[PDB]
Amino acid sequence: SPSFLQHALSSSDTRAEWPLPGGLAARWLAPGCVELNGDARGADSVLLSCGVHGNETAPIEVVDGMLTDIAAGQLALNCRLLVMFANLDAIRQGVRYGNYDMNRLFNGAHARHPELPESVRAAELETLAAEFFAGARARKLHYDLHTAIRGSVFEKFAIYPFLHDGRTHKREQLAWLQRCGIEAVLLHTQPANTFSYFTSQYCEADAFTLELGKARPFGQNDLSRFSGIDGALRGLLSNPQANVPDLDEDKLPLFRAKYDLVLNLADSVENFTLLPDGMLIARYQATGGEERILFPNPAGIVVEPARLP
Amino acid sequence: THSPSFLQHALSSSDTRAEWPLPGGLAARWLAPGCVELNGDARGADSVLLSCGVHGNETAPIEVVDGMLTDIAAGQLALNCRLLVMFANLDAIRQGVRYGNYDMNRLFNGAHARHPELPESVRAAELETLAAEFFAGARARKLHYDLHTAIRGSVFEKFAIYPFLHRTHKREQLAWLQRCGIEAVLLHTQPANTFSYFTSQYCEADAFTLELGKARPFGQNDLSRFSGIDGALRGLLSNPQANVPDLDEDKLPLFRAKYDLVKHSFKLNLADSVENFTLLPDGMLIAATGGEERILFPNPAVKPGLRAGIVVEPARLPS
Ligand SMILES: [Zn+2]
Ligand SMILES: [Zn+2]
C-alpha cells in the first residue's frame, strides 16, 4: 500500500487519490501514472518516466523510493510532479518489451501500429504528458530514465533533443546533468520516435533521455551507483530554485551523429567505442580516429565530437 | 634580351632553362616550361609555391602573379622567401581554355598515371616532381597557394578549399586567409586529385586551393577586385615574418561535404546559374535538412551514374 510501484503494477484502484503530507495529494491519472502537487500553480513541473523498457529497473526503484519518502514526509515536494511507470506489462514480466519497443512508438509513431497494446499505452502517455505540461507556468522538465544491458565507455550519458538551434537551450541543465554524474551528452536535432523528443518538440519541455547505467532485475541494482541521479532529483523536487554551480565543459564531452545505418563489431561491443582511422564498417569507413559507434545491432549510429552553436 | 613578363616568356618559350639575374645578386631559374624559381638558394627562408593557370581560362591570378614577378625583377618588390612560380597548364593558357583533353586539377595525386597518353598528364607529373623537389629543400615554412577563378558565382565571393588532412587544420593559415579576403573555407574530408592535396599530403605542406573570383580572359580582369590576395601575397614574399592578426573563427565560416547528389535516369530544383554555397532552406531536399546546408558545384548536365552536385554543411574546429 505505501509502495507506489506495487500499486502501479496491480492497479488496485484506477483514479483514487492518496493523501500526502503538507496538504498535498497523489492522484492516479491512469494506470501507473501518478501526479503529486499538481495544483502547484506556478511551481516548476517535472515529468519522471521510467520503465519504458521493463528490464531497466534501477531508475524504477529510485523513483519509487522518492515517492515513498514524499508520502512519509521525509522528502519535501515543491514541484508539480508526474511519475509514469511506462510499460507496465513489460515491467511486471521483467522484459524490454512485449510486442514492440515502446521508445520507438512515441512522437506519434504508435499510429502506425494501432493494434499493439504498447502503442495504445504510448498514445495515452503522450496525451497525459501533453496535458501535464500545458498546465505548467514555470520550468518544464522531463527526464526519461533508462539503464542498459550493453556496456558503454561513458557509463552514464544523456541524449539531448536539441531543437531550434538551441534558442530555448539551458546550459544550467547541462550543468545539472554533469553534477548528476552524466559523463557525456548526445545531441540530435533530427526527429525521433522517443518520449524525450515528443515532450521536447510537442510539449516544448527541456526533455532528456538518461542512460544511468547497467540493466538488472529488481533487487539486483546497486542503488549506490545511482546516488548522483538520486540526490539530484531529490534536490530538484525539494528545492527547484537551488542554484546550479555552472558547468565545467572541460569534463562534459558532447557528441552528435554524423550518419546512421551502421556489423564488423563484436556482439558485446560497448557504446561510444572509438573507431580507429581506416576501419571497414565503422561501405562506411572510419576516418579521423574520433568517431564512435553507438547503439550497435546488426542498426547503429556513428557519432563525432560536437560543440554548442 | 628577354621579355619583362615572366608569363610571356613562358608562353613564347624564348628559351627553356635560362637564368635571369635579380636585384640583390639573386636569380630566377627556369626549371621547366612555365616553372621559375626565385631566391631558391635562400637557406632557412620560408618556401612559397604559387601555381596559377591550372585551368587556362582563369587568368586573373595569372596576371597578379606575373605582375609580382615583374616588380621583383624590377626591384620594386623585395623577395625574402624561396619562391617557385608555376604557370601550370601552358597550352590551355595559350588557348584560353579550361583544358585541352582532361582537367589537370583532376590529374594530380598520381591520377595522371591513368591517362599516360595525355600531355596534360605528363605535365601534371612534372609539376608534382618539381614541387616535391622544391619543398624537400625547405627548412622553414612550406606554403602552397593554388590560385583559381570560376565562371559560376558564389555566395562567398572569395573562398578556399582545405585539402583532406590525414596537426589537424592550422588556424594560423586560416587567419592569414581571413585577413586576405577569403570569406569561407571548405574542408575536404576525403583525398582528391588536386594540386593542393598533392602538396599537402605528399610534400606535407600547408596547401590551399584559392577561388579568388570570376573567370575572365586576359585584359578583362579588374585587378582591383584582387587587391586583397595581391597585397597579402606581396607582403608574404617581402616580409613573411609579419605576424597574422589572429583568427576569429566566428567570422570565417567553415564547411564540409555532407553528401553527394547522385544522379540517375531527374530534376535540379535550382536555376542553372545558381551560385555556389547557396543556402538550402528547411523543406526542399532530394528524393537531412535544417536550413544549414548549402549547394556547391552543381552540375545536372552530367546525369550519368555520378554526382551532379554536393550538399555541404557547417564545419566546426575542435577549438
Ligand atoms: Zn531503455
Ligand atoms: Zn579552377
Side-chain angles (χ1 to χ4, degrees), chain A residues 190 256 287 304 307-309, chain B residues 164 249 256 288-289 316-317:
Chain A
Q190 298 300 291
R256 68 183 299 292
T287 170
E304 62 183 338
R307 297 225 308 174
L308 293 179
Chain B
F164 179 34
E249 64 179 67
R256 69 181 187 189
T289 179
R316 303 292 298 292
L317 287 169

Side-chain angles (χ1 to χ4, degrees), chain A residues 62 156 176-182 212 223-235:
Chain A
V62 172
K156 307 174 179 63
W176 186 80
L177 291 173
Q178 85 105 308
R179 184 74 176 181
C180 288
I182 304 303
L212 308 164
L223 304 181
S224 323
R225 307 270 302 199
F226 297 85
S227 66
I229 186 66
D230 179 61
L233 285 178
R234 281 170 179 269

Side-chain angles (χ1 to χ4, degrees), chain B:
Chain B
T1 190
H2 64 65
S3 178
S5 172
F6 284 63
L7 177 271
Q8 203 55 59
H9 176 77
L11 287 178
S12 293
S13 306
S14 296
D15 308 299
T16 37
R17 272 65 172 184
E19 173 182 281
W20 301 346
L22 269 49
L26 304 183
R29 290 173 200 149
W30 289 89
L31 305 179
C35 302
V36 61
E37 180 197 76
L38 301 80
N39 197 209
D41 298 337
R43 283 175 167 292
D46 290 323
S47 295
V48 176
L49 171 57
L50 303 182
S51 56
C52 57
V54 161
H55 288 139
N57 62 312
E58 320 184 342
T59 74
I62 302 176
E63 306 183 313
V64 172
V65 170
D66 193 53
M68 293 192 293
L69 296 174
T70 305
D71 284 343
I72 293 184
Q76 216 97 305
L77 183 67
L79 179 65
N80 292 291
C81 311
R82 290 183 71 235
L83 170 63
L84 175 54
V85 174
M86 292 181 146
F87 292 115
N89 199 332
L90 286 170
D91 287 275
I93 294 175
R94 177 167 36 246
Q95 299 297 299
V97 300
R98 187 181 175 80
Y99 56 75
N101 301 144
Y102 205 100
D103 187 326
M104 186 168 286
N105 219 24
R106 287 185 56 196
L107 292 174
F108 291 100
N109 186 43
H112 50 264
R114 284 71 185 183
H115 302 290
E117 70 288 345
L118 303 174
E120 274 152 330
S121 300
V122 177
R123 174 62 166 186
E126 174 178 67
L127 297 178
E128 295 193 336
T129 301
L130 276 49
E133 303 180 331
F134 177 69
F135 282 127
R139 287 293 138 62
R141 299 188 298 167
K142 291 178 295 300
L143 306 171
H144 176 25
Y145 304 108
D146 184 29
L147 319 184
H148 294 250
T149 46
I151 291 73
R152 180 185 302 290
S154 169
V155 169
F156 298 111
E157 242 281 297
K158 301 168 296 176
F159 69 90
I161 309 301
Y162 210 140
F164 179 34
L165 299 176
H166 302 214
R167 281 187 50 64
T168 322
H169 307 86
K170 192 172 190 174
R171 44 199 302 150
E172 209 303 296
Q173 277 295 298
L174 286 176
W176 187 83
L177 293 173
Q178 189 186 202
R179 276 72 201 300
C180 166
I182 306 303
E183 311 175 11
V185 185
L186 172 69
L187 320 169
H188 268 172
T189 49
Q190 293 93 186
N193 300 315
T194 58
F195 198 17
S196 67
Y197 176 67
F198 172 73
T199 55
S200 174
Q201 198 54 46
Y202 194 90
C203 308
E204 60 183 10
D206 295 303
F208 314 84
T209 295
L210 304 185
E211 286 292 328
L212 304 167
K214 310 168 183 182
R216 288 274 188 296
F218 290 112
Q220 284 182 42
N221 296 298
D222 196 298
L223 296 185
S224 185
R225 295 302 317 294
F226 302 82
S227 69
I229 215 299
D230 183 50
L233 236 37
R234 288 169 177 272
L236 172 58
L237 303 176
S238 286
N239 181 47
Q241 289 313 300
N243 77 296
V244 185
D246 204 2
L247 177 275
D248 177 49
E249 64 179 67
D250 297 307
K251 180 179 184 58
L252 185 65
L254 309 173
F255 302 85
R256 69 181 187 189
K258 183 179 175 183
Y259 64 94
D260 304 320
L261 294 171
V262 182
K263 262 54 176 62
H264 33 60
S265 85
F266 156 69
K267 292 179 180 60
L268 201 288
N269 293 169
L270 292 312
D272 192 72
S273 70
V274 60
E275 289 180 353
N276 284 308
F277 291 111
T278 290
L279 184 83
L280 288 2
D282 180 63
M284 59 147 271
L285 225 63
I286 184 174
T289 179
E292 286 289 63
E293 342 92 284
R294 301 170 176 275
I295 192 58
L296 184 59
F297 303 143
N299 195 322
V302 293
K303 59 153 284 69
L306 311 162
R307 70 181 185 66
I310 58 177
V311 175
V312 298
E313 60 177 2
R316 303 292 298 292
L317 287 169
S319 290

